[PDB]
Amino acid sequence: LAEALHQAL
Ligand SMILES: [Co+2]
């Protein structure tokens, strides 16, 4: 999740 969100943002 941490990096999924990092990509998204
Ligand atoms: Co990252």
XYZ file of N, CA, C and O and ligand atoms in Angstrom:
37
model
N 0.800 -1.198 0.000
C 0.000 0.000 0.000
C 0.842 1.260 0.000
O 0.511 2.205 -0.694
N 1.919 1.285 0.779
C 2.703 2.501 0.940
C 3.162 2.971 -0.429
O 3.097 4.157 -0.766
N 3.632 2.028 -1.223
C 4.224 2.401 -2.486
C 3.181 2.541 -3.580
O 3.360 3.331 -4.492
N 2.082 1.812 -3.475
C 0.957 2.034 -4.380
C 0.577 3.506 -4.306
O 0.393 4.178 -5.331
N 0.438 4.004 -3.083
C 0.051 5.381 -2.862
C 1.159 6.325 -3.317
O 0.887 7.393 -3.868
N 2.416 5.942 -3.082
C 3.512 6.777 -3.547
C 3.433 6.985 -5.060
O 3.545 8.120 -5.554
N 3.198 5.910 -5.810
C 3.007 5.989 -7.271
C 1.848 6.898 -7.630
O 1.987 7.776 -8.475
N 0.704 6.676 -7.002
C -0.468 7.483 -7.249
C -0.185 8.972 -7.104
O -0.692 9.780 -7.869
N 0.614 9.342 -6.113
C 0.790 10.746 -5.788
C 1.996 11.323 -6.481
O 2.116 12.537 -6.604
Co 8.207 5.123 -3.113
